Amino acid sequence: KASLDTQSTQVETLKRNLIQLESKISEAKTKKEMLKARITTAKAQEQLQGM
């Protein structure tokens, strides 16, 4: 029971950690989108030359 309780506490922490990890990857993905928006701005300047 003691071992199980320790394991239960540990698995719960792991689950919480996994949720945090999921949040972290999403945050990284968001950064890429922001970078992509910046890339579009550079493209807009080029569009000016075409105009």
Place this chain on the structure above:
Amino acid sequence: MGLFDRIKRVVSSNLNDLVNKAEDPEKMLEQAILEMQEDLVQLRQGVAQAIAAQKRSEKQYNDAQNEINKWQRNAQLALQKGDENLARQALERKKTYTDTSAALKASLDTQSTQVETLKRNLIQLESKISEAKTKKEMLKARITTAKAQEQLQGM
């Protein structure tokens, strides 16, 4: 000094020759049109992906809220049980989860603000490509005028 003079002359001559060969309005515009459209498609996909990611994040956030409710029920049960340790654990669990939920909400709100801006930007981009297309039509009209002069010779 002689080398520098030679380099400048060579560079100017090479650059001038190169730009003229590639200076075609239709080819340059088409390549530019393809790139923006590709970027727009990627941006649209990214926005959709971001929305999907946000939805996935929302589901996780919803699960955390559900977990808190379960913990809250357990805390009430713990009081009935009379065990001090179970009640204390539930309170600790509720606080971290609430903090995590708040953090997730803040992140989601920022993401929501960002996606909305991206959508607005995408709409602006769509307007921009259309404007470029309009310019080509105007250029085409000018081309017809040149053709009309030639028609005069035929007449």
